[PDB]
Design a protein around this ligand. Structure first.
Ligand SMILES: Nc1ncnc2c1ncn2[C@@H]1O[C@H](COP(=O)(O)OP(=O)(O)NP(=O)(O)O)[C@@H](O)[C@H]1O
Ligand SMILES: [Mg+2]
Length: 614
């Protein structure tokens, strides 16, 4: 793809720097060309004494997904002129609680509360993440202690005499609150602790994230400073934060300042939440109550929060953050001896380099290049080398990943197809059918010993009322019938996921399951519905795919990307149900194999209380 060898870090910066600038300009253009205007706001001083405007935008399934934290710029327009400008940040996006975007605006005064149409939602571009990428390339080139010198040479592809990191290993490598390790995982931990640089590779469910949590536990039990743990996406970092919390380490989850409205299983571990509960600093406590219920108290509250952050950050055992989030100014002046990056194959190399240059002497990279890769909008940058992850470049350089092969997530039948198509049948099972026979679940499949079937459903795929996305109302109905059948059978709502490629299908499934659901509306609200991105590195007991397209033209998500389908088929533990049109999905070498294998196992069925289909 691109020459993996480099003379020095100056030359490295000169290659990657322009690539990053190419990506920064491209999606600056794209963001500023995504303006809506015919929208109607919904003003109200939200119960936390801060103005929170609501609005609905046309359903568009893009790759630049509007996330919680993005800066948005309102604009009152039309004939009736308190015409002004107002800036805020996204406190909520389309989800299970209705498909309405909320923002929490900074200032609350000049904004007219005349809830009146003809506004203009502009997506404010931030160079933040690209600035951090460029800054990290500069630190690699200029800062002598950015990396250990061994790692400096190994990252540039130089020939280096091997170094053995000396340390007192533990007697036993399994960590307390995590699963008992394999021989392969025990080997991975033992080997990793004594190498300055290591890659860990492995198919879905093979304990990469658990093994990473275990490694971070032992690195923390050394006398060093805080271990830095990263992943490219917020979802993957939450997965890792949770496993590390289970070992009993003092964890701090750093996130961007605007993403404090997020709620995950370990949201309480976040820095902004830990600071609210500072029992050692009652005075920022007094000021925090003040902002809820001035100008001088603002600069004092600001510096008081800066002090509390420094205290928890410098005194933590582990700091979990996004790769890009490692370049956060609050982590400036800090250095990290040990650094691990889960899901490293999902990041571009400059993004992945943001944490690395903060003093790395021991570096662990965990990945799977058959799962989600980097997202590069600009095709020119991608072709010029930005699409290759750090992990993958080191593999070309000859470092051999420690490999995990035994999965413990899925049922043998579920892992059968993904292994043969994506991993050459080299993904095997450390769990059997007896282990994945859901306890307290009276449901019988169209073929026992095989918790899976492709439900056939031809239907009118149409466009979304507002937007460019697609949906399939006939399938949606069938997906609620499957969801209702699983819930009555014993399955808990929070252990069912529904993956679908399109935004129009997601939005429709949320409203339709709640309104027209047989059971309580609160139960369908508890069932997650999203694209594969939402389930990155995660697992549910049951998954339901909803392939929307019943037409001729290309798809987008798991319809035409091998990476995304693999991830879609490897989230389930106890069973998976795919819903879609066999004919429409057939025009795709990957999906035509799926339909063949399912027909051979006598699970290509149709019509409630079902039987085989041709
Ligand atoms: N040695 C083990 N023994 C028993 N169960 C295990 C073991 N390792 C992992 N598991 C199970 O697998 C789950 C953790 O899988 P995980 O560490 O997230 O795999 P992963 O490689 O990160 N999957 P992915 O992120 O999709 O590539 C846990 O719920 C465990 O029950
Ligand atoms: Mg994972």
């Amino acid at each position: 793809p691109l020459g993996s060898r480099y003379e020095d870090a100056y030359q490295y910066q000169n290659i990657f720097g322009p690539l990053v600038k190419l990506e920064a300009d491209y999606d600056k253009k794209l963001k500023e060309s995504q303006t809506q205007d015919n929208i109607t706001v919904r003003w109200d001083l939200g119960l936390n004494k801060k103005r929170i405007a609501y609005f609905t935008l046309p359903k568009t399934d893009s790759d630049m997904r509007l996330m919680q934290g993005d800066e948005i710029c309102l604009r009152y327009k039309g004939d009736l002129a308190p015409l002004w400008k107002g800036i805020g940040h996204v406190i909520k996006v389309p989800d299970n609680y209705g498909d309405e975007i909320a923002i929490e605006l900074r200032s609350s005064v000049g904004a007219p509360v005349e809830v009146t149409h003809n506004f203009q939602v502009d997506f404010v571009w931030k160079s933040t993440s690209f600035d951090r990428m460029q800054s990290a390339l500069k630190t690699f080139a200029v800062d002598e202690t950015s990396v250990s010198g061994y790692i400096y040479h190994k990252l540039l592809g130089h020939e280096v005499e091997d170094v053995i990191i000396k340390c007192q290993l533990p007697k036993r490598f399994t960590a307390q609150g995590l699963p008992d390790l394999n021989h392969s995982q025990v080997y991975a931990v033992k080997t990793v602790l004594q190498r300055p640089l290591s890659l860990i590779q492995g198919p879905p469910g093979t304990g990469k994230t658990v093994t990473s949590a275990t490694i971070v536990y032992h690195l923390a039990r050394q006398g060093n400073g805080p271990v830095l743990v990263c992943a490219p996406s917020n979802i993957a970092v939450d997965q890792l934060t949770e496993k590390i919390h289970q070992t009993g380490l003092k964890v701090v989850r750093l996130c961007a300042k605007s993403r404090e409205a997020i709620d995950s299983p370990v949201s309480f571990l976040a820095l902004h939440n830990q600071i609210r509960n500072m029992d050692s600093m009652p005075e920022l406590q007094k000021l925090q109550q003040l902002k809820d219920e001035s100008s001088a108290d603002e600069k004092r509250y600001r510096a008081l929060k800066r002090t509390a952050e420094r205290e928890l950050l410098m005194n933590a055992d582990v700091i979990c953050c996004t790769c890009v989030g490692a370049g956060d100014p609050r982590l400036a002046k800090m250095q990290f001896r040990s650094i691990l990056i889960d899901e490293s194959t999902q990041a571009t190399e400059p993004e992945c380099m943001v944490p690395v240059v903060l003093g790395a002497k021991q570096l662990i990279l965990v990945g799977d290049h058959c799962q989600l890769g980097p997202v590069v909008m600009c095709k020119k940058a991608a072709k010029a080398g930005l699409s290759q992850s750090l992990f993958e470049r080191l593999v070309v350089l000859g470092i051999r990943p420690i490999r995990l092969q035994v999965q413990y997530r899925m049922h043998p039948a579920l892992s059968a197809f993904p292994s043969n198509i994506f991993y050459e049948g080299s993904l095997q099972n450390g769990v059997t059918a007896a282990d994945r026979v859901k306890k307290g679940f009276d449901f019988q499949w169209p073929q026992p010993d095989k918790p899976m079937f492709f439900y056939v459903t031809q239907g009118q795929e149409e466009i979304a009322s507002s937007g460019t996305s697609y949906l399939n109302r006939t399938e949606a109905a069938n997906v609620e019938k499957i969801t209702t059948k699983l819930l009555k059978a014993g399955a808990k709502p929070d252990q069912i996921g529904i993956i679908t490629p399109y935004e129009g299908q997601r939005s429709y499934l949320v409203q339709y399951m709640q309104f027209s659901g047989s059971l309580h509306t609160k139960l369908y609200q508890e069932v997650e519905i999203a694209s594969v991105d939402a389930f990155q590195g995660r697992e549910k007991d049951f998954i339901i795919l909803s392939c929307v397209r019943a037409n001729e033209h290309q798809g987008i998500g798991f319809l035409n990307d091998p990476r995304r389908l693999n991830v879609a088929l490897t989230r389930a533990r106890y069973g998976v149900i795919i819903v879609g049109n066999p004919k429409a999905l057939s025009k795709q070498p990957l999906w035509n194999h799926l339909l063949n294998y399912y027909k051979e196992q006598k699970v290509l069925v149709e019509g409630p209380l079902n039987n085989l289909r041709e």
